[PDB]
Design a protein around this motif. Structure first.
Motif, PDB file in Angstrom:
ATOM      1  N   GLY A   1       0.781  -1.212   0.000  1.00 35.52           N
ATOM      2  CA  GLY A   1       0.000   0.000   0.000  1.00 35.52           C
ATOM      3  C   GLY A   1       0.821   1.276   0.000  1.00 35.52           C
TER       4      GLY A   1
ATOM      5  N   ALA B   1       0.439   4.831   2.355  1.00 34.35           N
ATOM      6  CA  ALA B   1      -0.271   5.440   3.469  1.00 34.35           C
ATOM      7  C   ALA B   1      -0.964   6.722   3.042  1.00 34.35           C
ATOM      8  CB  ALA B   1       0.690   5.750   4.607  1.00 34.35           C
ATOM      9  N   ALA B   2      -2.089   7.005   3.678  1.00 36.17           N
ATOM     10  CA  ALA B   2      -2.855   8.201   3.379  1.00 36.17           C
ATOM     11  C   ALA B   2      -2.868   9.207   4.517  1.00 36.17           C
ATOM     12  CB  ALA B   2      -4.291   7.829   3.008  1.00 36.17           C
TER      13      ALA B   2
ATOM     14  N   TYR C   1      -5.288   3.359   3.576  1.00 36.85           N
ATOM     15  CA  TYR C   1      -4.193   3.331   2.623  1.00 36.85           C
ATOM     16  C   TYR C   1      -4.736   3.038   1.234  1.00 36.85           C
ATOM     17  CZ  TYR C   1      -4.469  -1.754   3.154  1.00 36.85           C
ATOM     18  OH  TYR C   1      -4.903  -3.051   3.206  1.00 36.85           O
ATOM     19  N   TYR C   2      -3.861   3.167   0.246  1.00 28.92           N
ATOM     20  CA  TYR C   2      -4.200   2.999  -1.158  1.00 28.92           C
ATOM     21  C   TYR C   2      -3.806   1.617  -1.644  1.00 28.92           C
ATOM     22  CZ  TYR C   2      -4.896   7.997  -1.544  1.00 28.92           C
ATOM     23  OH  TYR C   2      -5.335   9.285  -1.399  1.00 28.92           O
TER      24      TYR C   2
ATOM     25  N   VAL D   1      -5.015   2.363   9.875  1.00 22.66           N
ATOM     26  CA  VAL D   1      -4.513   3.211   8.796  1.00 22.66           C
ATOM     27  C   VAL D   1      -5.335   3.040   7.527  1.00 22.66           C
ATOM     28  CG1 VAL D   1      -2.597   3.573   7.244  1.00 22.66           C
ATOM     29  CG2 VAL D   1      -2.186   3.369   9.626  1.00 22.66           C
TER      30      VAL D   1
END
Lengths: 51, 63
Positions: B11, B13-14, B25-26, B23
């Motif tokens: 991923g 992180a956002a 995340y993308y 968390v």
């Protein structure tokens, strides 16, 4: 409602369903026979001697 | 000896968080080369794409 940071997509929420109930009625048959043995003897509100 | 599962990237992180927190995340997209926080021994562009040769996430260049 769910908390979501304003970059990511989102969350999906599930749902609910149904139920059923069925019923059928019951059948009732009482009866009487009437003889001459029930008609003849004296019903109580009747005078003595001659009916 | 055997590569740990910490060595397979997934991923991006956002928003920041500590341990014990969760968390967002993308998992897919096309991302910048320089805005992401890598670490050392992974400097050049070719290795950063070799991290994600396979995923939905692809790491391109800005012009």
């Amino acid at each position: 409602a769910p908390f979501v940071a304003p970059n990511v997509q989102g969350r999906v929420i599930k749902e609910s369903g149904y139920n059923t109930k069925t019923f059928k009625p019951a059948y009732v048959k009482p009866k009487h026979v009437i003889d001459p043995n029930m008609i003849i003897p004296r019903q109580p509100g009747e005078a003595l001697g001659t009916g | 000896e055997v590569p740990a599962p910490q060595s397979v990237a997934i991923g991006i992180a956002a928003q920041p968080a500590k341990s014990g927190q969760n968390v967002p995340y993308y998992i897919g997209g096309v991302f910048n080369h320089a805005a992401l926080g890598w670490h050392a021994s992974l400097d050049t562009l070719a290795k950063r794409q070799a991290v994600f040769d396979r995923t939905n996430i692809h790491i391109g260049n800005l012009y």
